[PDB]
Write a protein that binds this ligand. Structure first.
Ligand code: HEM
Length: 154
């Protein structure tokens, strides 16, 4: 797939708002993911024992990971599709060490779109949400193709 420059503009305009508070957005997104799809919390040995949202909110480890995820994804989005280098080490670790099925990447993509819609309604109208969705589909598609080269396709 290929996004037009106007679609990348929409994606990078709302991402610039997320970047004013990377740790807060990271928390919201992961909590939305774990509340919606609790099976995903099991991949985290660091904090799969968390039982409630309150515990999740108070976890410093969870907030750190949120920053890790959003910083890596922000660097990929800013490439505007030229992200081959960035995707290599990510696809290897998620396919061979963590073992994250593509389906889980779809789940976190939904959680991102939900939180942007909640926090940034004025910069996340239908067109900007369609463009973010396209940017995340592109990301999943390219990661899925690398999983396959790596021997995992999950
Ligand atoms: C937007 C999508 C995602 C991005 C950009 C991302 C990025 C990262 C980065 C940069 C790391 C640390 C370096 C490395 O291990 O490669 C990491 C580690 C990890 N990721 Fe993610 N990730 C994403 C989705 C997921 C999902 C959906 C799951 C699980 C349901 C997952 C589970 C893990 C695990 C278990 C670790 C190890 C954490 C540790 O113990 O510190 N990732 N991820």
């Amino acid at each position: 797939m290929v996004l037009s420059e106007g679609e990348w503009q929409l994606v990078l305009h709302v991402w610039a708002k997320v970047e004013a508070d990377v740790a807060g957005h990271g928390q919201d997104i992961l909590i939305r993911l774990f509340k919606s799809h609790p099976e995903t919390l099991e991949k985290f040995d660091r904090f799969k024992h968390l039982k409630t949202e309150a515990e999740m909110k108070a976890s410093e480890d969870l907030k750190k990971y949120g920053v890790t995820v959003l910083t890596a994804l922000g660097a990929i989005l800013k490439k505007k599709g030229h992200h081959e280098a960035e995707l290599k080490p990510l696809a290897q670790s998620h396919a061979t060490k963590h073992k994250i099925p593509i389906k889980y990447l779809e789940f976190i993509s939904e959680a991102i779109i939900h939180v942007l819609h909640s926090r940034h309604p004025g910069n996340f109208g239908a067109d900007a949400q369609g463009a973010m969705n396209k940017a995340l589909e592109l990301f999943r598609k390219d990661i899925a193709a690398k999983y396959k080269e790596l021997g995992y396709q999950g």
